[PDB]
Write a protein that binds this ligand. Structure first.
Ligand SMILES: Nc1ncnc2c1ncn2[C@@H]1O[C@H](COP(=O)(O)OP(=O)(O)O)[C@@H](O)[C@H]1O
Ligand SMILES: [Mg+2]
Ligand SMILES: [Zn+2]
Ligand SMILES: [Zn+2]
Ligand SMILES: [Zn+2]
Ligand SMILES: [Zn+2]
Lengths: 654, 297, 535, 293
């Protein structure tokens, strides 16, 4: 009936359609009313935010137009939805006579957050005619400015009669009174502004590294600026991968502080309205690292969820799957289905993902279950695709090459912000990968200067910085997955591994596992691998008993978060015996990797990880034996001469 | 809309061969391209046919706003005609109606961009003419006498800037009188208005405060590119030089680094930007305004 | 022209006065006694416990003050002045609250609490010089020679608004008289996020703290302090260029007869502190005597260092006797004889040397840990920050300056460059660093001890060569390391089984299997007492 | 080298509810009064305005009794603030005349001149005092002297003698600009360059750099009159009192000395004791009694 000038929105029609959609909708558990129970649960728990999936509207018949109206004119539609939601809540409480305490709900506020806007084509692909539209982005957080106060109510005083005024901002402008409103006192130009008496809001600016799905020819990475307000402030930390939904904006910028002149060319940014920090294709952040942030979120009443939700049916299925007896091999086979055999490599990767138990001594002292792995072997094997899979499955991490890195670039640096024109600190790769997995390729081309820093992180998971303006120690609780290329063309089995790899022997003893990927010619294995590879090209799209990735990630996340194995005497005896045995065997030098206390630590961590798998709470003899067997098999000592350190090429089994 | 000059030349020759007179629109456009853009825009606006498809929920907000503006124009015109006829004080009535009323100018109701493209060597050779606008040139040969003309440059791109919104007309809304105020801008910088300029606020004693409205504004998609000489064009023992190109409208994103291209454009000047102490008179800076791009591969 | 008044402000004034006059097996009243003490000793500040202010009137006064401290502070001052006049005979008085229920983090500040009193904790990084502050100015009118006195500033240079005498109608034309005004001491400090609150994958935050009056020169760089005070806002010109709409202020032109001063409203959050306390005798002299009278005290001491590491009695005996130093001597000819001890621990990466460094940095009073490659010349020694927003330069301390009369832990010592090696050499030669930058010259004390960890040049300690052939240090610095402890691996079954048992005991039992003879507090007390005998 | 940007507007929405005492509503009410008021079933003012336009006399004669009868509020406002209301009524007359003229043409006007007539009680010239300053008064007297016609400007074209920056001024104490306006008026980007040259020497046109171009300006007629009390009623032993009046445009050359007239005008002052001023009258209407045929 009555549209709004410039738009085609009708308030009455939109509110009626929204109310009808709220009162009637279902997924077609799938037959029951959906938003009704969401509203009831919200009013039960006191929450104020409704996360609306914009795709839902496109299913119901009526709102097929409200969908496009929401996409095109978010400003009006969001307020309309909020008012409709409040009216619906009051109607729900009153029409059924639940309880007469409705003043709190009638007074408080509400909000609706769309979070499934249609796919976008990347920020650079937009045009000027897309301003003030709704879009979404994918990227990695780099920096966030501190909290900036924004005035909302200005407070004035009269310097002759003490009369005080309060003024509300209007579209970013304050109307300063020119005359005291008192009849007794109406002196002109007597109003003074008392800064501390005003009421301020919260605003924050975040820098985002966009990662578009489609990349045109010859296009390089860049950065975008996001503005967050009110609750969402401090909801993001650098290194997190997020999916953001917001409004596309524009603004002119002053040429200089002195004048009031503006520049013709505009500045673009994004205004955040929803943030998603969870995905079904990747694990969930280790909650052991974000303990305080959870309490801060609860205090701030922001409704962003860090970890995914688990249903009773899902938990029952998890228990059923853990009940069977082939679970270990099943999971190993599940990891990276496109990679053939390499069962022990896959098992090691799985155990790394699971990780050990993190002890913490009251009165100071830290121990972490991070596990470090290094891969050696022939150059042409599949030791690099393993890195990609771990990088894309882990929540946090960085993939680096040995020769393309630097000591400063791995720890931290100081840079001039191009907007504020001041100097600000930035995080390095090792700090960005905190709580996750750091991938290093060609670890043997890295310079000694660069390699120097890895010692401390691999020793105590911290990095100490003493540079101009900063003197402090930072956490780097990340696992290390490294690859190396043996000297020359092929790993010669007639020489010790120390004569094959280009690393100092002492440095090798720090890693928990060492893998030798040897390439042996055998007709059966060649036939099997060739058939496996050729099968992938039978049809234009992939079709390859393997669990789905979503279920696998759900299981691993649940296991990581909900259980904590502990060690027992039966395990302690075996650990001590095995460590003494290793120290004795092999006792003229630099022919093998000398055993140290790092190996005992590796046994502890691997046994804890195995126990944590399969949903146990006590580490035992089977776990200890499996850990020792895996450690031995990785270096394949069974095919080695314990006197000259050479390999018997005919004893190794594919 | 793409206006080709071969069509104009064919039209002129067809008019000539059967006797009737015709002017050298081709030469006029070639020598003073920048002025004919408005002539063509007005000629088209005088003839644009009506839409045969209704406006639905799957249309652009820009088109929605333009349609609203046109309907509002018609509404004021009809209202004024009715009010004037009611007084009992038709061409004269119409004329006074237009004279005494305000409207939205055509530029705020247009929805299309207009570009020219050069004269083909083949067509010029067949018609026994010399296609100046399609003779490739290096940045070396483009001197001051070429300013204001339509010319073709052959070069290799080296840098392209991102697409950003360039403002052409700012719009403000006055709450006191309900008017919309439009401020043109054609400089690298501008100044925002403060107080209303509409008739009602101008006559009244208490004037309203203007506010900014982004959606009603008139924006343009703007890119700048740097073009460089080819090796075979540089004289012996010299260094290649560069040149600046501006791209506006739907022609953006058509140039990428490393492309060897022929760009057609209008050559225009710009204010001086060097040190004051080295300024001797009215020196100016030059740039090319793009109209058509042809790739070599 | 009668002045508007705040009934609530007055009411809280009388409530505060009643608190002061009422709040008290010998009974006693504390605040009146403290006022008497102030009269006796000529002081300026009062210390009012926050807890005592809570258990009256159902705490309404406590809240009102907490969330509206800024509004009511003048009324509290007025009440204090009146009670002082009543019960005792220019003086500037200060109030100091402390012992708040909770402490916030620098990461958890919000614009909602602007103008509210709270408490924060952090590590100090820098301090500026004490400078006078314009408190209550005096001005002379121009069109007439009238004199106005006691004009308050309130965080900005404020002028009189109207000539006090109707004989002259002057406004906005004045001259400042610097000869009969009053000033206060004013200092700026910079604090940084503490180490263990920094969230994952983020860099630390920094905050400014303004100190006034007698609280000045109570902070010290490199310490952890707890502040209690107000949160405020100050103008910020840098925010221009950020995205978003920045508030502006313009005058209202409606209702003014006819016939442009626009301002911007960008700000940043600061903190004006009122109470600052550092955060780390009594009956315990009994225990001190009991423990000193022991006979195997030295052996128990040696056993008590670094209980989490196995063996290395010599290294422990070095860490001790580095904690306790010698005595500095002065000769008549001006020659100074050093009394400090420096230690180097040499070993390949597979050893457990870094644990000693971590224990020392965690235990010792003044200690700083740093790595060879993650540092720089400026990071060590010092730097000069000439961009003091209000005036002359200032000195930002470095790692060496930190831990003065303390211990500096240097890991990966072998990777240090020639420049910083020379700096450390100068530090050992003379207990001074010479700074010469931006035309500023200075000398800074570095009376420190050095604990360095070094690796063999070839990765492994070739026992065939000598120490000089195995290390990479330069002869000058090498000559002044009076203790070199080379740690090496010996294969033996009983040692191996004992070490494995110890490690597994720590992992399985955690804190239980430590049982050291003495605790950290006892050890620190003993060291503090013993450090002052001068044998 | 670019041209000047433009500015323009158009109405879309409805602002706040119009107040009664605002210039636009005053103009609307005056226009309604002109186009609607009826006497003896006639549109007297519309008809006489049409005839005046036909005759090329750009003035309208109005009687105050009709206005007070039609509406009282604007009558009081005019009687109290004549200097503020008259221009509004003048522009309303001009607006109506535009329509009438354009319609008649098919079937460049200046501002029309309002002339007021009245018959209310007069005030003896000896009773004028402070309370009547800036009000409207009616007087009776005898003309004794009329000056010669003067010349005043209504539209001036001016040029800066140094940089040749041109502009215009319209009148309806105006003074020429004191300094060149080409600086504050940033017409074009190239104008900024043109405003500087020959190295570091700043551009300064000097004080009063403008000159008038007489070939393209328009002027009007102004005249002075003197009015004196009737000699019959003067008190004995005292010379009579007289007063100065100013008229312009269509109220010039209407009377000759010796005529007994009634005058409707405004009581004003000007500067020529400590704070004394010289009163005089601005002529709004003249009514003769017919003398010396
Ligand atoms: N076991 C395997 N399963 C699947 N593909 C394999 C296997 N071994 C080799 N390949 C194929 O051979 C190539 C291995 O090269 P790559 O892994 O990149 O070398 P690198 O040893 O540096 O990781 C891949 O293209 C992969 O498809
Ligand atoms: Mg590879
Ligand atoms: Zn007042
Ligand atoms: Zn207006
Ligand atoms: Zn004075
Ligand atoms: Zn001039």
């Amino acid at each position: 009936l009555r549209i709004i000038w410039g738009t085609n929105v009708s308030i009455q029609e939109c509110t009626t359609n929204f109310r009808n959609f709220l009162m009637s909708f279902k997924y077609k558990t799938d037959e029951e009313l959906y938003y009704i129970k969401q509203l009831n649960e919200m009013r039960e728990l006191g929450t104020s935010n409704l996360n609306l999936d914009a795709r839902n509207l496109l299913a119901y018949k009526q709102t097929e137009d409200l969908y496009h109206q929401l996409l095109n004119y978010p400003q009006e539609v969001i307020s309309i939805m909020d008012q409709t939601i409040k009216d619906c809540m009051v109607s729900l409480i009153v029409d059924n006579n639940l309880d007469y305490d409705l003043d709190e709900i009638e007074t408080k506020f509400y909000k609706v957050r769309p979070y499934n806007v249609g796919s976008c084509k990347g920020m650079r692909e937009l045009n000027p005619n897309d301003i003030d539209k709704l879009i979404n982005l994918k990227g990695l957080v780099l920096r966030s400015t501190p909290v900036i106060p924004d005035m909302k109510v200005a407070f004035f005083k009269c310097n002759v009669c003490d009369h005080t005024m309060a003024v509300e901002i209007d579209r970013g402008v304050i109307q300063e009174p020119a005359r005291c409103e008192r009849i007794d006192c109406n002196e002109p130009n007597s109003m003074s502004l008392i800064h501390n008496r005003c009421s301020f809001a919260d605003k924050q600016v975040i820098k985002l590294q966009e990662t578009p799905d489609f990349v045109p020819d010859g296009q390089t990475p860049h950065s975008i600026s996001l503005c967050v307000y009110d609750e969402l402030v401090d909801s993001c930390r650098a290194g997190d991968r997020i999916e953001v939904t917001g409004t596309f904006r524009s603004i002119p910028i002053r040429a200089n502080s002195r004048q009031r002149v503006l520049k013709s060319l505009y500045k673009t940014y994004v205004d955040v309205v929803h943030v998603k920090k969870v995905s079904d294709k990747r694990l969930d952040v280790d909650t052991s690292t974000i303990e305080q942030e959870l309490m801060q979120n609860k205090v701030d009443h922001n409704e962003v969820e860090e970890v995914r939700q688990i249903t009773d049916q899902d938990l029952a299925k998890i228990r059923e799957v853990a009940a069977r007896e082939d679970l270990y091999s099943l999971l190993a086979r599940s990891i990276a289905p496109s990679i053939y055999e390499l069962e022990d490599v896959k098992k090691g990767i799985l155990l790394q993902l699971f990780g050990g138990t993190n002890k913490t001594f009251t009165k100071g002292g830290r121990y972490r279950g991070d596990i470090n792995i290094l891969l050696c072997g022939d150059p042409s094997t599949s030791k690099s695709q393993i890195l990609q899979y771990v990088h894309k499955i882990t929540p946090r991490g960085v993939y680096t090459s040995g020769k393309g890195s630097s000591a400063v670039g791995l720890t931290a640096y100081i840079t001039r912000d191009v907007d504020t024109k001041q100097l600000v600190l930035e995080s390095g790769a090792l700090v960005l990968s905190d709580g996750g997995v750091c991938c290093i390729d060609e670890f043997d081309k890295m310079s000694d200067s660069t390699r120097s820093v890895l010692h401390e992180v691999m020793e105590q998971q911290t990095i100490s910085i003493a540079k101009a303006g900063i003197i402090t120690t930072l956490n780097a609780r990340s696992s290390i997955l490294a690859s190396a290329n043996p000297i020359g063309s092929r790993y010669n089995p007639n020489l010790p591994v120390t004569e094959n790899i280009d690393l100092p022997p002492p440095l090798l003893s720090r890693f928990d596992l060492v893998y030798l990927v040897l390439d042996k010619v055998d007709e059966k294995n060649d036939r099997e691998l060739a058939k496996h590879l050729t099968n992938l090209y039978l049809e234009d799209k992939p079709e390859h008993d393997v669990l789905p990735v979503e279920f696998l990630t759900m299981y691993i996340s649940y296991a990581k978060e909900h259980i904590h194995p502990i060690i027992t005497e039966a395990a302690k005896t075996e650990l001590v015996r095995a460590y003494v045995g290793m120290r004795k065997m092999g006792d003229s030098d630099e022919k093998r990797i000398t055993a140290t206390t790092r190996q005992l630590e590796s046994m502890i961590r691997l046994a804890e990880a195995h126990a944590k798998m399969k949903l146990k709470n006590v580490v035992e003899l089977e776990d200890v034996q499996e850990a020792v067997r895996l450690i031995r098999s990785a270096i394949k000592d069974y095919a080695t001469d314990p006197k000259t350190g050479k390999i018997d090429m005919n004893l190794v089994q594919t | 809309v793409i206006i080709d000059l071969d069509d104009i030349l064919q039209y002129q020759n067809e008019k000539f061969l059967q006797g009737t007179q015709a002017d050298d629109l081709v030469s006029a456009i070639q020598q003073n391209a920048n002025h004919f853009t408005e002539l063509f825009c007005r000629a088209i606006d005088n003839n644009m046919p009506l839409p045969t498809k209704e406006i639905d929920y799957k249309d652009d907000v820009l088109d929605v706003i333009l349609n609203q503006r046109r309907l509002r124009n018609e509404r004021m015109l009809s209202d004024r005609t009715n009010e004037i006829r009611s007084e009992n004080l038709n061409d004269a009535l119409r004329e006074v109606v237009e004279d005494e009323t305000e409207l939205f100018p055509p530029n705020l109701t247009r929805r299309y961009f207009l570009y020219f493209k050069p004269l083909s060597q083949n067509c010029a050779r067949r018609y026994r003419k010399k296609a100046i606008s399609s003779k490739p040139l290096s940045v070396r040969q483009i001197k001051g006498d070429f300013l204001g003309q339509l010319i073709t440059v052959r070069g290799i791109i080296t840098r392209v800037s991102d697409v950003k919104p360039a403002v052409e007309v700012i719009a403000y809304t006055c709450d006191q009188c309900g008017y919309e105020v439009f401020q043109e801008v054609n400089s690298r910088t501008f100044t925002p208005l403060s107080e209303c300029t509409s008739e009602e606020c101008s006559q009244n004693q208490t004037k309203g405060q203007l506010f900014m409205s982004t959606r009603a504004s008139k924006f343009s998609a703007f890119q700048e590119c740097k073009i460089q000489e080819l090796s075979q064009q540089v004289p012996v023992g010299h260094i290649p030089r560069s040149l600046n190109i501006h791209v506006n409208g739907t022609l953006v994103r058509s140039l990428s680094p490393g492309d060897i291209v022929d760009v057609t454009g209008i050559f225009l000047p710009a204010p001086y930007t060097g040190f004051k102490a080295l300024k001797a008179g009215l020196l100016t800076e030059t740039y090319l305004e793009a109209q058509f791009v042809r790739q070599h591969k | 022209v009668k002045k508007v008044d705040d009934v609530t402000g007055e009411k809280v004034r009388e409530a505060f006065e009643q608190f002061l006059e009422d709040f008290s097996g010998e009974v006693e009243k504390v605040y009146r006694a403290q006022i008497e003490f102030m009269k006796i000793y000529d002081l300026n500040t009062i210390y009012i416990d926050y807890q005592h202010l809570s258990m009256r009137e159902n705490g309404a006064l406590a809240m009102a003050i907490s969330e509206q401290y800024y509004r009511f502070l003048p009324f509290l001052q007025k009440g204090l002045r009146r009670v002082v006049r009543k019960y005792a005979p220019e003086r500037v008085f200060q109030i100091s609250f402390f012992n708040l229920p909770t402490v916030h983090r620098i990461r958890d500040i919000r614009s909602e609490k602007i103008g509210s009193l709270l408490s924060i904790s952090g590590t100090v990084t820098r301090t500026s010089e004490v400078r006078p502050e314009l408190y209550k100015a005096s001005f002379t009118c121009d069109m007439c020679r009238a004199i106005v006195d006691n004009v308050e500033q309130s965080f900005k240079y404020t002028e009189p608004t109207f000539c006090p005498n109707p004989s002259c109608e002057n406004r906005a034309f004045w001259t400042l008289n610097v000869t009969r005004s009053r000033f206060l001491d004013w200092q700026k400090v910079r604090i940084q996020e503490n180490a263990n609150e920094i969230p994952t994958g983020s860099m630390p935050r920094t905050l400014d703290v303004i100190l006034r009056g007698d609280s000045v020169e109570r902070a010290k760089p490199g310490d952890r302090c707890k502040f209690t005070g107000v949160e405020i806002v100050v103008p910020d010109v840098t925010q221009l260029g950020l995205p978003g709409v920045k508030p502006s202020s313009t005058l209202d032109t409606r209702g003014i007869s006819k016939t442009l001063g626009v301002r911007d409203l960008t700000y940043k959050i600061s903190f004006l502190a009122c109470h600052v306390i550092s955060i780390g005798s009594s009956d315990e002299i009994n225990e001190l005597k009991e423990m000193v009278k022991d006979e195997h005290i030295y052996d128990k001491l040696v056993r008590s260092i670094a209980p989490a590491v196995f063996g290395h009695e010599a290294v422990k005996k070095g860490i001790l006797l580095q904690m306790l130093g010698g005595v500095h001597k002065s000769t008549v000819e001006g020659i100074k004889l050093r009394g400090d001890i420096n230690i180097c621990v040499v070993g390949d990466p597979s050893t457990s040397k870094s644990q000693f460094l971590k224990y020392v940095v965690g235990f010792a009073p003044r200690s700083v840990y740093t790595s060879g490659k993650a540092s720089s010349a400026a990071g060590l020694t010092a730097a000069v920050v000439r961009d003091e927003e209000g005036g002359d330069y200032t000195i930002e301390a470095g790692a060496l300056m930190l831990a003065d009369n303390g211990i500096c832990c240097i890991d990966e010592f072998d990777k240090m460059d020639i420049s910083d090696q020379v700096a450390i050499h100068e530090a050992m030669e003379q207990q001074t660093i010479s700074i010469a930058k931006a035309g500023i010259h200075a000398t800074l004390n570095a009376r420190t001890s050095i604990l360095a960890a070094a690796n063999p040049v070839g990765g492994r300690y070739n026992r065939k060569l000598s120490l000089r052939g195995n290390l990479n240090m330069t002869a000058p610095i090498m000559s002044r390391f009076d203790l070199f402890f080379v740690i090496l691996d010996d294969c033996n079954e009983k040692i191996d089984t004992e070490l494995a048992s110890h490690i597994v005991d720590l992992h399985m039992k955690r804190d239980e299997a430590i049982e050291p003879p003495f605790s950290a507090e006892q050890l620190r007390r003993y060291i503090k007492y013993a450090r002052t005998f001068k044998p | 080298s670019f041209d000047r940007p433009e500015i323009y507007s158009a109405p879309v929405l409805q602002g706040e509810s119009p107040n009664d005492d605002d210039n636009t509503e005053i103009i609307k009410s005056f226009k309604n009064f002109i186009l609607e008021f009826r006497l003896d079933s006639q549109f007297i003012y519309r008809d006489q305005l049409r005839n005046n336009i036909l005759v090329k006399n750009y003035s309208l004669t109005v009687n105050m009794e009709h206005l007070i009868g039609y509406n009282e509020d604007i009558y009081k406002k005019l009687s109290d603030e004549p200097s503020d209301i008259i221009p509004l009524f003048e522009t309303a007359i001009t607006q109506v005349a535009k329509r009438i003229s354009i319609l008649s043409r098919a079937q460049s006007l200046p501002t029309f001149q309002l002339i007021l007539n009245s018959n209310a009680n007069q005030i003896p010239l000896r009773d004028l005092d402070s309370e009547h300053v800036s009000k409207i008064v009616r007087l009776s007297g005898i003309i004794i002297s009329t000056s010669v016609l003067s010349s005043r400007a209504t539209y001036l074209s001016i040029m800066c003698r140094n940089c040749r920056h041109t502009t215009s001024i319209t009148i309806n104490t105006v003074s020429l600009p004191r300094s060149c306006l080409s600086t504050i008026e940033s017409e074009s980007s190239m104008a900024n360059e043109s405003n500087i040259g020959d190295e570091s020497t700043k551009k300064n046109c000097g004080p009063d750099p403008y000159i008038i171009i007489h070939e393209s300006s328009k002027f009007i007629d102004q005249q002075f009159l003197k009015l004196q009390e009737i000699p019959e009623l003067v008190p004995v032993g005292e010379m009579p009192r007289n007063l100065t009046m100013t008229c312009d445009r269509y109220l010039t050359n209407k009377v000759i000395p010796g005529t007994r007239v009634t005058i409707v005008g405004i009581y004003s002052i000007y500067n020529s004791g400590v704070a004394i001023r010289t009163p005089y009258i601005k002529i709004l209407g003249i009514q003769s009694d017919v003398e010396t045929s």
